[PDB]
Every structure is written in structure tokens, then in C-alpha cells.
Amino acid sequence: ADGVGNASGNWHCDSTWLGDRVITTSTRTWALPTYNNHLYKQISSASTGASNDNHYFGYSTPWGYFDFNRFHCHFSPRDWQRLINNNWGFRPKRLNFKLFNIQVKEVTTNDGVTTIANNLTSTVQVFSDSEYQLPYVLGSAHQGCLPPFPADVFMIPQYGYLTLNNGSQAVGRSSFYCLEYFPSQMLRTGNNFTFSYTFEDVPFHSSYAHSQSLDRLMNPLIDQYLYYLNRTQNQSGSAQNKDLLFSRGSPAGMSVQPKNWLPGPCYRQQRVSKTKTDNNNSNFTWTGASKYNLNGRESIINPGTAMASHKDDKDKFFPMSGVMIFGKESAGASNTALDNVMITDEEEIKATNPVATERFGTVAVNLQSSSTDPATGDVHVMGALPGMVWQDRDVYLQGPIWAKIPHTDGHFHPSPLMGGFGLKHPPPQILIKNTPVPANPPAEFSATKFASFITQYSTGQVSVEIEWELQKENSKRWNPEVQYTSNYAKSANVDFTVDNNGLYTEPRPIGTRYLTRPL
Amino acid sequence: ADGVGNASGNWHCDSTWLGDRVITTSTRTWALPTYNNHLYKQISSASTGASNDNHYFGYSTPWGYFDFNRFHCHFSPRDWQRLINNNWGFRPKRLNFKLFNIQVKEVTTNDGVTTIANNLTSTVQVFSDSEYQLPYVLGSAHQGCLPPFPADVFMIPQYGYLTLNNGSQAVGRSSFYCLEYFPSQMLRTGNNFTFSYTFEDVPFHSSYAHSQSLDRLMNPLIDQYLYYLNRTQNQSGSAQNKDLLFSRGSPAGMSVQPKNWLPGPCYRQQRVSKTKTDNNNSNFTWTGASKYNLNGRESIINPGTAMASHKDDKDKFFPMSGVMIFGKESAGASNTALDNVMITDEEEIKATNPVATERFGTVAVNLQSSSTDPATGDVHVMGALPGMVWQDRDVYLQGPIWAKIPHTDGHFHPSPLMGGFGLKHPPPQILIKNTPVPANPPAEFSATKFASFITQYSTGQVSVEIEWELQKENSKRWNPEVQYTSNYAKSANVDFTVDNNGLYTEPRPIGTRYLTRPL
Amino acid sequence: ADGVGNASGNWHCDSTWLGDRVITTSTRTWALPTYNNHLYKQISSASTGASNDNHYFGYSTPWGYFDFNRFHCHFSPRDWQRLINNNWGFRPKRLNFKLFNIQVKEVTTNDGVTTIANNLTSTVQVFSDSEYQLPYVLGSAHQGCLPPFPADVFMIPQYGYLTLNNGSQAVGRSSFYCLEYFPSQMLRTGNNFTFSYTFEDVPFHSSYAHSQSLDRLMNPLIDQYLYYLNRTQNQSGSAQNKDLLFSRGSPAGMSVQPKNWLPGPCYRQQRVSKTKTDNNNSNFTWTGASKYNLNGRESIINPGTAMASHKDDKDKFFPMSGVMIFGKESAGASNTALDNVMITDEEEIKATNPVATERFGTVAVNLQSSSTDPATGDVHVMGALPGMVWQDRDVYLQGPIWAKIPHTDGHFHPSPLMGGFGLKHPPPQILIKNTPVPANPPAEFSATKFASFITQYSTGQVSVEIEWELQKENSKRWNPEVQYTSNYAKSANVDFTVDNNGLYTEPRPIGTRYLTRPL
Amino acid sequence: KENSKRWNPEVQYTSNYAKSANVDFTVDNNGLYTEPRPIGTRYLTRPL
């Protein structure tokens, strides 16, 4: 239960702050079509003339899925502000899902005149793959998430997946999943669906920027008790003579003092400028791109290793594929102008992580001697070395929240490369589909496959509640900190607001790293 | 109860393995038309010019029936694999039926424009003939079973039956059953129907192949203590002279050692080749066919006695009507090409059962003496002889499960000749029908039969749960066994999968005999 | 325990009669060699030029096995007499096995002078395959059983088995068993092995002959109330005219009276005479032999269906392969003279079973009419028909006791065709082997297979106790019955006795059918 | 144990059924045990 003329759920949609806790609960109203005419279909790069690196094999499903894996699905711009401006970190604790006031309509089109009526007896099916038995497509930054603006109605994305492929063909080990082979709950107007999940223990997300840097971590007023080789050729003597002179760590030469740690790992990336003139005249997008080679296919590393987007005084350049880029509502599908996208800046970590477009360092390459000169080389790729420390890619008000850690034998610091929390057991995929309704069948039994169905779609609200744990700050810093603030200068439109046509717009990407914390 | 806007059942459809048990529960969504305009109709071969062997008399009913008598209605291809690759046998224990979310629509066609609306007050009737008072039509391999692929919608078959006939006429002892003369439950959207049955004690199905053969069952290293007549004419003596020389069972002559058992019974069948050239140029399909003669009418024995489909090294031939043949989805109604069907191979039993196209053996036909020579003959038909042992026809992922043992005075090893379990009291026939809805009647009483009805059909889901009992294996075999495995070699489509158009396809027939067990 | 100088078992070997019970317990002393040098070896008809029907594939094992599957292993001639002369039937109930006083000797041969010494620390391994996981070779009438005469020392047979074969090659489904992969108990002089088994419920063996025959089972003094068609052509009328005259069952014509039952099933066999002159001059041994065809290979049916060895007054002929034949101690391996074997006579069942060399009967083959004459044919092979009754092949003092019913889907009256009790779970195979003893190994590690071993054999006593259940007789017969009796007439040697050289000899084969019982 | 919701059959290690002179992982006519090929453990499927 209960009934047809009885709401099966209310509009819960608030935000509650409780010291070290904050419950965000937002509800949006959705629309679900009938996909593929209730058919599972094999799909492939086959006959697309697709590049060799773009081949793929998989299946498109008749099911739709719920996806709220974006911060703006839960935090209003103002809340996000509250969060990033006063806390050193946060993480998800537990969540709550709910489907209600579901209504199934049946459209009868004819003579251009289409009519929409209720089919009070139709059902919609749901089920959460809580045992992760289906391929996981959440956490690949796809569209179809809950809209940022509560007053927006959205369309549920269609669920499709991929599997092992050799060119545009499949292989023996390829897998095909049928979602109807999963116990799922059926609903009619008066029914509703609910379910709760608990997040696994996960590190707080570092919502702060360091107020010191690895190199500048010593006492500016005092020497060290350590010495380093300072000269191998004596100064003057009106001749250049071989020697071995040592000096001891001085504040006057911090760049040469023995230290305890190393910058973060790094996989260098090409650098491009926001002013076309500076760029080389060619299309190096794929040519000079940092790609990884997985079984014959190349794939751009994007955004790849967390690295400072640019060195100080140069928010002019950016890693060719080392920064998150969101599109403004104006941006088109492909080859859209620069001012139609928003490129994130990850320079807040230049204090501990290597800059993405530069060399990580220099390495000795030979054995110097009186007869052969000491040579070196530039290291462009650097794996994990003991003593390394680093910061992970920051998250954004419109970025991903989590991603499922692949189920592999081993894995290194599994933090989703494009921002987020790495979960061994993430929130499960919620699958929904309209059950088929056979149109009038022949008056004489026919065994051939049924392919005539009442055309219909469904609609209802969905509520998602998440309890977040805050990590308050207690900086003993004396001077004011940086804080996200809307510009007070007058203008035609207000940031994160609708316009004269009712189109909600997210002007810029907001990070979370404003508050300071020493190393 | 309960209501209109309230689902009366969920989509249970899983599979659970519990050591020696396995519960398969699958649910499909169905569509039921109005058959015969709610009329019972007499039907016969009368005026069809039908052959003499094809005459028949019976009645077609306004009712529809549920039929899930095919393994693929319960086992997914993968499950079937699990089953056949690790168990020596299995059998049904108990089942559970359920009808729900039933919806009755009423189509109003006009001007080519047809409209489908709900008739919230209409009813559908169901009832299980649990006392087997109606002619049993399940277990005759008819279409209309639950689809293999869960996502398929199917049409319920129409229930018709036959009775005693003399040509195209009926006889005094002929029977006519009216299904409305059975207490049946009526349902409206909010209602549902449920019922459970328990299988009778039945032998496990032999899901294994023998790793020895009747003839080769002795100790290869040792003689016997028995002797046999070896020669009746002395060897050499530069003359051929009468004699009586005996030898004793030696490994050097196993084909002549006294044994304890005999191969299985046999009723020889003609042999045809898959390469037309080898075949005789004529249409012997019926001509040289093995037929039985029951009261003036002939009927092909098909598949008849369980016999090896061909001797070793010849999966090229096959019994003309001694093997199960399923059609690929491409196969047509009649006279379709070879590669549109799939012919089962029953050679796994050549170890104990006679080959179907050969003679069972040789028999002495006279009394030899010095004056008359010892003659013999080929035995083509062999009834049960004491000491006989045999294997029954294997079952297939897309074959029958059970059949009702006819209610006759006697019966021999009643295992359904075309595969399956012989049940004295099988799952009952589930009958369903849409109750008639008189269209507007005349405004003045008329006693003549009512023949104007609201045109309508119904639809809903049906769930069938079966608990199967497994007979695990404990072979002390040392070397690996054969196992059903999908080919790993790359290809365009995956076996037992949908294609680019959403058409599910069962590439080959899967048996159950892979594991080995000695005699 | 216990010790080296301590007997681990006594010589139990008696026979006890207890009304309806009789416990036979006999013990013999055995000798076990080292077979195959402790090696498992693949063996086949490969490269033997062996006939096509004699091909085979299998493995010879390093193990030996105990076999007491012959009546004379438990019954002395006198006991057998007691049994067959006073009981209407008997069957096995439970048994007891025991291995003791085992001694392992190690032979050191050299310069023709061989020396035998005790290896007090060597072990012998035993184990009963009580789960029937190994191919069963008992019940194939092989040599190596316990000797009839208690004072005889015997050699344990070597255990080998066969498996699926295609010519002299193997197949995928072929099985290879390693006996070392079975938990087995190890023994040194002071140890012993014991185990008990219980026979399954089985019909008593019919140790009697019928004192009536199927045809002559009515009242000689009274008519029947039934009539039969006696003439179809009127007698006399000085003309032969069509008619229909009926008579009623009279004692004067028993051969034509309606009856209730039919003789036993039958598969005709060629007939040969003990006096070569009567026989046809040719070698029809295989030519005109009744053979069965199992997957390309032919095999003589021997002894096949239980049938009377010859009609009354003709103990001169015999079925070419329808009677058991034991060899006298003088008989050679092959092509030995008639008087070196003993051919059993199964004429005691001519009262209910068909004679083996004759036709079972006559059958109508056409539809007679004034224009076409009534023809018939001789039926040489007859399967089981309802109403059939029959007697099984008798057992002999030196014949088999039981056989394992093959593990097949179905089987008909599974009584071992060559005499005995058909057991689903027979006494298990007892396997014994001398554990290898590495000779001195190289002084420097070598991974190659070890192939140098101390040459040794073992010896000890084995006791087998079986409790048999008797079925006493209570015939109300007035005249004396036939009884097995040794001839009283004087002669040079006593039957079932040793001769001047100490060679025990079993003069003739003794059946069990002497006592009478009406149908 | 595995609980793949996969629908199509998986790959499985299986001895070849085609006839031949010797059986895999078996002794020969001389009693020499032989391991014909190396068997891995990766046959069953599991999504990432």
C-alpha cells in the first residue's frame, strides 16, 4: 500500500548542521522513458570506421539508473560555501534512498495529436545491485545525475555497459548480464521503494591548502649539524684546481640543505596556453599527448596524476589533459570555444606536488672522472619513492563524489584520479525500468517473439539523504584566511541563479581548498 | 484484496545454490487474448483431405494454459553449466506458482484507429486441475512455454484436446470436457493466485557418461576360469576335420569371454547422412520409416528407444527419427534447410545402449549338422531380456522436464521417450481465461444465445519456483573430465545472447552428460 | 600392535549349521609378489594385430586384490551336499574379512644362488574400496580366488582395469585411477587388518527343480468352461468345406487348452554335439555364433539367457555358448580336448524356460483369406512378454557367487547372466600391495625418477567368514527326491580328494537343483 | 565461491574429448607420469 489517490512520500529537502555533522537531503522529480522498446541490444564500434583505439563491445539495456554522484546534487552553493570556508575536511557516513509518488502515463499518438493518460495498473521495477554483480558505470562522470537546482525535472539515464573486446568483436571471456535475472521490486502508483547504505571508513578529504612547502620547512634562523659537498674545484688560487670543500646547512642556502622528504610522484604532461598565439601551430592534442598503452589501445592519461596546474604567476597555462574541465551551459558537444568551458586550477598543491608541465627533477646519468665529464638528464616520469608525500586532486561543487575501487589484486593509493573517495563497496547502482505492457495480441496463438507494446513512461520524485562528517578546524593562525566569497561589485545577474528565462547557471567551479594548515 | 493502484506481487527471479539443493525461481510477463470468442468449438480432420493416419477429433477451448515444462524456463545458460559440470544427477522436489499484477485491457478498434483502455472491473479466471480430470497436453513438446530470456513477453497458448476418433468422426466413448464446470478463482487487478505442488519420488536423472563399456568390463590382466567352444574344425592336420576344441577366457580375446549382462533393448531405425550425396535419391522419410501401427493408423516412432545416435567416428550420420531436433530461431515452419535446425547427439550412451541404425545382434536360425549348414540372421528389433541394462535419453537445456505417465494397467520403465521424468502425478495444468463481458444487450429480452462482447485481453507476471535436489559427484578419477565450455576464440556474437536487434538466440543444444562415472 | 614374535591371528576355518543359518568361515595362506616393479603401466591391444573386436585400452596396476567370489571358497564338497540336498534356497547375509600373520621377505639373488631373508620393517598396504570408486573386476570369473582345498597356498592376482577405447586408442572420457590416491592402512609383521560388510536384501537362490511344467499345470480329470476354434474346414461331408467348429478344453488335448502364463524369454543359440561326427564340418565357432553388437564390436552372448541346455533324452548336445564350462585340472590354455573340460547341464529348467537350441515358438505372419493362405514363421528371439515366468541359471560349487549390478539408468531382472546374486552394493574389492623399498640411492641428489628397489614379496593368512541364510523345505511330496550322492561303486580315487601326488581335484560340477517344488 | 550474475557460459578447463594415443596427466606404457600442459587458475569471470 497504500492507494491511488494517496501520496506515497513527501518532499524532504533541507540541510542540517550539527557541529561535526551535516545532513544534506535533497529531492528531485524525475521522468523515465521506455528504452530500446524493452530490448537488450548488442552494440559495438563495428562498422563505425572508428579508430583502432576507440573499438568496443557491449550491450545496451532497457533499464534506467539513478545517479547522484556529484556534490551539487546534495550541497547548495551556499552550503558548499559553509563547508569549504570552515572545515579542514569531510567524508560521507551513511545515506538514505527513496522512490515515491510514482505515476505511469501511456501516450497514444495519432494524427500528430498525441494524448497522455494514466495507466493506473502499470508497474515500475527497481532494485539496488547491493552485491555489485553488475558492471559499475557510476563514477565515470556521465550526465544524468540529479540536477543542481531543486526545481529542475530530469530524465533518468539509460543503463548500458561494456565487456572484453578484440577490435569490434567479442571474446570467449566476455560477459552478458540480464537485469531481469535479479530479484526486483515492482511498484504501482501507491507503492514506494526505500533503502539505506552505510559508507565504509574512508580518509577525510583534504579541504585545505598547505601554508608551507616541502623545501621551505626548516628553521630560517639556525644552521644544521650536517654538511654537504659544496665545491669540487677550489675558488680562485688564480687557477682552477680540483678540490673537496664542504659547507654546512645554512639558511643562506636552503636549496641545498639535507631534507627528510620528497615531492609527490609525477608523470609529465604537455603544456598549452589560453592565448593561442603562444601555442605551436599544429594539432598536438593526440600527437604530443601523454597516453598509456593498454593491450594495443592507447588512451589519454586524463587528468592523471595530481600535479600543480602551473607554477606561481602563470594561471595562464594548463596541463593539456591534467585538469578537470566543466562546460558552461552554453558549451556545445564538440569543438566548442574556450569561453564555453571552465578549466579547474589545481595550483593549491604546488607546495607538495610537482608541477604537471615541468620535469620532476634531474638525475645523474654517468660516472664522472677527470677524463669524462659529469652528465645528467631530466626525469619526466617518477614513480613512488620512499619518503614521498603528496596531496590528492581536489573535488568540486560540480565534480564526482566517489568511484568504485576496481576489484584487482593490488592497487596503489586508490583515490579516484579525477577527484573523490575510493570505495571498496560504494553506494550501489539503483536500477529502474518500466515493465512492458503488451498491446492487443493476435486472436490466435503465435509463438514468435512479442513486439507490440503500449507506449508509456513514468514519473515521480526521488529523495537522497546523506550524513556527512565534518572535521572542524582549529588553526592557531593569526592573520585572516582566504575564503570563497561572491563578488560584491554590482552586475546584471547573480552567481548560481536563474536568468530571465529560468535557466539555472553555475558560473565557476568551486574547489574546497581555502583554509590553511601547516605541513 | 488488495487494490487497483497496488502491486499484487514482486519480481522474484534468482537462482540459489545450497550444497545439495538449488532453487531456481524465474518470472516472466505474459499476454492472454480472448480465444474463439469465448466459444467451445468441435474440431476435426474432417474435410481437410488429411491422410488416413492424420485423422482426429476433438474440441478447441476458450481457455489458455500455463506451461513451463522446459529446462530453459528455469535454468540460465550459466546455471545449466554449473549443474551439468559438477553434478552426477538431479531431480525436482517441490514447486511454487504465482499469478499477479494482472491487468485487463479492452481494445476499441475503429477507422483503423484502435484504442486500448483499462477495464478496471473485468476478471480473469484461473484454476489448477490438481485432480487430473482434464486431458493432459503438457509434455508433448508444444510451443508456448515460458521464454528462455527473462526479458521476453510471451503469449499464453490456447487449450485444446483430442478424444477417441474413427476417421474424422467421433465415437460413443468420446469425451467432451467443459472447463467452466470446474471451480475456478476469479481475479481483478488487485487480486493474485498462488499454489504449491510437491514432486513425487523419482530417480535422479543420469547427468553423466560411462567411462567403461559393457563388453570391456573385465580385468585386462587375468584369465577366466570359464571355457568356451573355440573351434569345431581342427586347425591344420593338412585336412579340415570336425572337432571340439575349447579355450578359456583370455584378455587376448575379450570379444568372446562369458559376460554377465546384455546391451540395452533396441528397435532399429533407418540412417541418414548430413551430406546429401551419401543418401539414396528418393523420399524415404515415411516410406522406409520405423512406424508403429495403432488401430489402423501408422505413427512414426520418434525419437523412440534410447540408442546411440551413431558409432564412434561418425557424428556425420543420424537416426532418421531417433534424435531430438530443435530449430534455430531462423528455421521455418516446414521443409527448412539443415543449418536451420540443431540435431542432438546421443552418442554418450554407446557404452551401454545399442547404436540406433545398426542391428542389435545376430541369432542362430537353424539346427546345424553335417548335412545342413549353421545359419544365422540379423535381429533388428529386441525386446527386454533379463540381464539387460541401459541408459535413458539425455535431457537438454531446451528440452522437456517431465511428462505424465499414462494411466494404464501396466507400463515399462516409464521414462518419457523424448527425455525427462515420468510422473504419475505431475505438476497440474494451470488454466486461465478472460471472463466474457457482454456488449450492450438489446432493450428487449431475447432468449437466443448472446454473441456480442467487449473485446479485451489481459496481462500480468507469472512466477515459478522449483527446488531441485542435486546429487554431487565424488569421482576418484585422476585425469581431468570433459566440461561444457564456451569457446574462447573471438567472434562477432556471444553465445546465448541477444544481437544488435534484441533477438535472444540459443546457439546449440546443451546436454547434461559430461562428468564420468564407471559402470 | 602387537609384536614381531607374536601371531596376529589364528586359523579360524570351520562351518556351523544353526537351523536356518549356516556360517562358513575358511582361511587360506597367500603369497603376494611385487607387480610391475611398483609401476602403473598403460596397456592396449595396440600393436598386437588383434582382431577388431578384441581392441582395448586400460592400465595395469602395481596392486594385488583379494577375491573369494566362488562357492568352493566357502563350502566344502560335503557342506555343499548338505546344502543342496535339504534346502529350497539360500542367500548371503553378512561377511567378515581379516588379514594376519603377514610376513615380508626380501630375496637377494646372485650367482644363481638366491637367498630369502625377513625384512622386519617393511610394510604391506590394504584397503577396501567400500565406496566403489574403482572399476569393479570381481564377478568376471577370473582366476586367483581362494583355493577350494584349504591346504593350498595361492598367489594374489594383479589388479588391472579397462576404460573407454576407440580401437587401440583412448578417448577424452577415459578414466585413469591411481590407487595410492586412496587412504590405505599400512602393516608390519605385528599388524593385522579387519573389516565387515553386510549383504543387501536379495532373493533366495532357487535351489530346486520344478515338479510340473507350464503346459501341464491343469486338472487332468476335468474339462474347461472355455472353448477354442478347433476346425476351419468341416470333417468329411465327402468334400472339404469351410467352417467354424469349436471344442472346449479337454484333458484329451492339453496342448490346445487356454492357459495363464508363457514360457521364459529366449535368444536362440546354435547347437553342437559331443560326438564330432554329428557336427557340420567347418569352424562355425564365431561364424554361426549368437553375437551382440555394441558400438562396432561384436561379442559372443555367453552364456546369455537362461535356457534348457537340451530337450529330454539328449544330454548329448549343448548350446554352443549357452552353458558354463569349467576345465578339469588337466585342461590346457587353449584348444584343449573335450574330456579336459566339464560342461554344465541346465536341463533342470526345461519345465519353465525355452530350450536354448530351438525356436521359442511360431507366429502368424499374414492375413489369411480364401485367396491367400495362412502362413507363419519361427520366432528365434523373444523379449519379455507380460505373463512370462522363468527360472534363472543355476549356480555351481565352483561357480560365481555374486556380481555387481552395473550402475545404469535401468536394468531388467539383474541376475548375473552366468549365475549368482545381483548386488547393487556387493562386497568391496580388497586391494593389497607391498610398499616399495628404495635400494641404496646415489650419494648425490638426483631428481630423476627412482627405479632401484629391494626385491621383496609378502605372505600371510586371510580369513573370510560368511553367514548364509537357509530356506528350509517342507515338501509334502510322498516319494523320495533326487539327491546328490557320491557313487558307491569301488574305484582308484575318491571324488574331491588329493591323489598320490597331492593334487586336489574337483571331478564334476555340482549344481544346487535337486529338491522338488511344484509350480 | 563465485556468484557471478553472468548469463552466458564461462570458459572452463576441459580435457580434449577428441580421441588419441594417451590420456592427459597419466602414465604411459612404461609407467612414466606426465603433465602435458601447465594449468592456470584463471577461467571464471568477474567484472572490474
Ligand SMILES: Nc1ncnc2c1ncn2[C@@H]1C[C@@H](O)[C@@H](COP(=O)(O)O)O1
Ligand atoms: N584517499 C585515499 N587514500 C587511500 N585510500 C583511500 C582513499 N580514499 C579511499 N581509500 C580506500 C577506501 C578503502 O577501500 C581503503 C582501501 O581498502 P582496500 O582496497 O585495501 O580493501 O582505502
Ligand SMILES: Nc1ncnc2c1ncn2[C@@H]1C[C@@H](O)[C@@H](COP(=O)(O)O)O1
Ligand atoms: N527413469 C525412470 N525409471 C523408472 N521409473 C521412473 C523413471 N522416471 C520416473 N519414473 C516413475 C515415477 C513413478 O511413477 C514411478 C512409477 O510409479 P507407478 O507407475 O508404478 O505407479 O517411477
Ligand SMILES: Nc1ncnc2c1ncn2[C@@H]1C[C@@H](O)[C@@H](COP(=O)(O)O)O1
Ligand atoms: N535374481 C534376482 N532377481 C531380481 N533382482 C535381483 C536378483 N538378484 C539380485 N537382485 C537385485 C538385488 C538388488 O539390487 C535389487 C535391485 O535393486 P535396484 O537395481 O532396483 O536398485 O534386486
Ligand SMILES: Nc1ccnc(=O)[nH]1
Ligand atoms: N599501497 C599499496 C601497498 C601494497 N599493496 C597495495 O595493493 N597497495
Ligand SMILES: Nc1ccnc(=O)[nH]1
Ligand atoms: N516394469 C514393469 C514391471 C511390471 N509391471 C509393469 O507395469 N512395469
Ligand SMILES: Nc1ccnc(=O)[nH]1
Ligand atoms: N525390471 C525393471 C522394470 C523397470 N525398470 C527397470 O530398470 N527394471
